[PDB]
Ligand binder design. Structure first.
Ligand code: NA
Length: 97
């Protein structure tokens, strides 16, 4: 089963809006069962329209917001499933401006 190894932005980061969010896992993801939802939890919870896709490599998931992210706090809830079928879930939070 996969573990999250790294993400851009990192947990607890504050800065400019990212063009995309990348999640990197320890095992190859099964794409049809793995996913993510982006939520805005605070403004200076609302779902944010975003496309989710496999990265360059099978261990990466990329989230691309449909519009530039506005200033506030965000949470990425993710679900990662590999060939052993056990779903692993977690959350990454970061702030924009
Ligand atoms: Na997927």
């Amino acid at each position: 089963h996969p573990k999250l190894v790294s993400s851009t932005p990192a947990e607890g980061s504050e800065g400019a809006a990212p063009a995309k969010i990348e999640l990197h896992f320890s095992e190859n993801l099964v794409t049809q069962f793995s996913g993510a939802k982006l939520v805005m939890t605070a403004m200076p919870p609302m779902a944010v329209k975003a496309a989710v896709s496999g990265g360059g490599d099978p261990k990466t998931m990329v989230i691309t917001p449909a519009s530039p992210l506005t200033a506030g706090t965000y949470k990425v809830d993710w679900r990662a499933v590999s060939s052993d079928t056990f779903p692993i879930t977690g959350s990454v939070t970061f702030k924009v401006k």
